[PDB]
Amino acid sequence: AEPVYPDQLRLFSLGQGVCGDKYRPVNREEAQSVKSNIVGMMGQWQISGLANGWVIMGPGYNGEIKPGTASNTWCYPTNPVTGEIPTLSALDIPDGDEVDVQWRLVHDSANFIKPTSYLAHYLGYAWVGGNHSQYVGEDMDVTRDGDGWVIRGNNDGGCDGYRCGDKTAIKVSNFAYNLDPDSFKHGDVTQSDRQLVKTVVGWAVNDSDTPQSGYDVTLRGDTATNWSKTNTYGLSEKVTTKNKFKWPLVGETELSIEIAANQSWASQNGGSTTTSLSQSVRPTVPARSKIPVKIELYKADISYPYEFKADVSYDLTLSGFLRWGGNAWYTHPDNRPNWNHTFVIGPYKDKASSIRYQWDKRYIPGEVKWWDWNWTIQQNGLSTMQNNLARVLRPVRAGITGDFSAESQFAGNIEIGAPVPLAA
Amino acid sequence: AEPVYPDQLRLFSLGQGVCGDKYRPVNREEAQSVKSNIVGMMGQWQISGLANGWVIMGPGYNGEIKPGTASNTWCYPTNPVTGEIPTLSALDIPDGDEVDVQWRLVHDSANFIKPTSYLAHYLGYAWVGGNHSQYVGEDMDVTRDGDGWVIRGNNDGGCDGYRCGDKTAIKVSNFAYNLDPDSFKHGDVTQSDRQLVKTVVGWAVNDSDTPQSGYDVTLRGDTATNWSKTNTYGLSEKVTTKNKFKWPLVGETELSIEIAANQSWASQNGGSTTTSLSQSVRPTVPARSKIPVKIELYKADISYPYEFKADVSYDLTLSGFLRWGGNAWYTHPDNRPNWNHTFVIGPYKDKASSIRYQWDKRYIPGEVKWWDWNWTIQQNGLSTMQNNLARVLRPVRAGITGDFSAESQFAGNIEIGAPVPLAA
């Protein structure tokens, strides 16, 4: 070992270490690491062979592992399938109002409602579906409720069965918008004509019988650039980031524009940066004459149609009630209890609300304090649990667009005019 | 003297200063420095010769040292074997989830369970082993308990002996991950094509009858570089360091990237540094003409597949109970007491929890306030205590991987174009 995932084991009944094409003896230590699961796969006084002269006896023997043999055996498996919940393509939401965005998510039956509905069903929630359909997740009503949204089982009309009404409700609560730097795209980039920032004019006077070319005029240092940014459609007010994001090098010019973290995107609509550029002129004015000189400095603006994407998080809540003799809550309650459990879709917050955390720790009995994902596998089949959860946890991503402009270019002229004979 | 280690002494009984091939007279001062141990090696009224006309009388004489002689003697030893607990090769743990890492350690029977089990046994703990084995440390059950792990004696099945059940449990508690700079390794290093950061364009105008080559355009100073780092597999959130770690000079470029101490590795996923590079152009424009000039600045990224190792600490706890007439607790209690003593594996914290501290001070009776390591040597043999403790205290080391990238290269172009005859 090397972790043992319960769902990869089965039972042979053909003799002394049967085994198969892709199946090898579970040893003593391996069994013990998850014997609380293995023992649940056999009858009270059922005895089966483990490996190397060791056997596992059922519940009537307290699950005890001892030396001996049997015709039943746990010669499983081979290089195990350890597929963690697969990732899927991001769900691109057409940059709208914060509310528009949320509305689109809760009404997307093909990517949100049915996937989530099946999750509830698999966990053991009762009545996940409306009175006009025989299928889970169909005939659901979407409605808004305060700061969240509710997907409810459509109790209109008649109904047969223990406890029609009190149908499992899926509530969508908190949202967060995390801007992802690497999603930066842009449209056609424009550029303005060179603008004259400033000039300086001077005269050099050589009132003598020799050139004496020893003098100068210089400009240097700052100099400054302007940065402006717009927000196309509202959402920006709730958009934040956890890292010191900087603007990408579009075209052929890099600007030192850093975006502050933990601030609304809409709160940083511009700024000012500096740079440097010096220029000098050193004339060779001929004897008895004057020469005019100029130093000129130019700008030029560039502009983008920018777009970023932000990851959208969800808080989900599943209302009661748990089905009798058929739910995944680790205690396996049979009192038809009202539940209300929450999940965080996206970033890790704690163990209880993290589907991935729990899924990834299925091999450790001591961590099973919430939902028994091993049970859900045994009931529905590993690959269906993987696909369902993959859809539930896919990465919803919302667009953020606007305009960008900046004084990015610099140019300079140094001009020396013709000599003018004195008088000065 | 020069410390005397009790375990290096024995007793001769052949006459007036017997001695041997590798054995020489213990003198008065030497004996006194550890007479509380030496006296325990003789009967109440047993008398033996020390050296130089001095003898040591047993417990009935209060261990008194006086002038005289005897046929017994303590002519021991020679250049003593003072082997401190040897160090062993680090145990490399395949960079996983914080929990994955811990799980691998507690299930490593060949490097953790049996070594630790023997430690408990040697100290005097009772029942270190399961009901299906006759050997210490075999048939142990591993289970998780809250923030720690428990290794327990497998009380399933029957059992004979005074107090079956209440078997010594080994608990593993706190962990800490200390990143070690010197473990830095990396994979294939990549490098990008030169990217254009910026340019500046200017014109020099010489409207005169002579070249007057006296002017310039310059760029200088900052300039900045970006540093990005990723975290492959979770653990990074708990990884810290006690020193101002800086990144190694990979390839041919040194970057001034300093990692803050006492912060999670995962909290420092990037940064920004600066450097400098200036460029100047000083044209020699011919009479009555113009020349265009450019100054260009370039970047280029490099990237690593990096790996560091972190030392893993442990807090160990050994539950009761101490064996009658056979334990190492310095008072030698015989009331079958429940114990619960803890040890810190790794860094020094105090005397009580430091195995190395205590081992290294065996020669000083006044420091024996916890475990009597001299007793454990007398019972098991020095070399077995050394090997066992070496395994217990070997240095577990966990991997930390991720990606690294940075704007490390710089290049620049200075271009002077061909002259263009006026008009300007």
Numbering used by the authors:
A (entry chain G), B (entry chain A): 1 to 424
Task: Give sentences from the paper.
Aerolysin is a major contributor to the pathogenicity of Aeromonas spp, which causes gastroenteritis, deep wound infections and sepsis in humans. It is a pore-forming toxin (PFT), which is secreted by the bacterium as a water-soluble protein, binds receptors on their target cell membrane and, following proteolytic activation, forms circular heptameric oligomers that insert into the plasma membrane thus permeabilizing it, potentially leading to cell death. Aerolysin belongs to the family of β-PFTs, meaning that the final pore spans the membrane in the form of a β-barrel and defines the aerolysin-like family of proteins that share a common structural motif3. Combined, these structures, consistent with the recent lysenin pore structure, describe the major steps involved in the pore-formation process by aerolysin: the transition from the monomer to the oligomer with the formation of two highly stable concentric β-barrels, the zipper-like formation of the β-barrel and the final piston-like puncturing of the lipid bilayer.
While the wild-type aerolysin pore is a membrane-inserted heptamer, a single-point mutant Y221G was found to arrest the protein in its prepore stage. The cryo-EM map of Y221G, shown previously to be a head-to-head dimer of heptamers in solution was here determined at a global resolution of 3.9 Å, extending to 3.0–3.5 Å in most parts of the complex, allowing most bulky side chains to be resolved. Domain 1, which is connected to domain 2 by a long amino-acid stretch, rotates by 180° and moves by 30 Å. Following this movement, all receptor-binding sites become ideally located with respect to the target membrane (D1, D2 and dashed line in Fig. 1c,d). Domains 2 and 3 are mostly unchanged with respect to the soluble structure (1.3 and 3.4 Å root mean squared deviations, respectively). In particular, the prestem loop remains locked in the same curled-up position (yellow loop in Fig. 1e). Upon CTP removal, the β-strands rearrange to form a β-sandwich in the core of which the hydrophobic residues are buried. Furthermore, domain 4 straightens with respect to domain 3 and moves by 20 Å (turquoise domain in Fig. 1e). The high-resolution aerolysin prepore structure, thus reveals an elegant novel fold consisting of two concentric β-barrels held together by interaction of hydrophobic side chains.
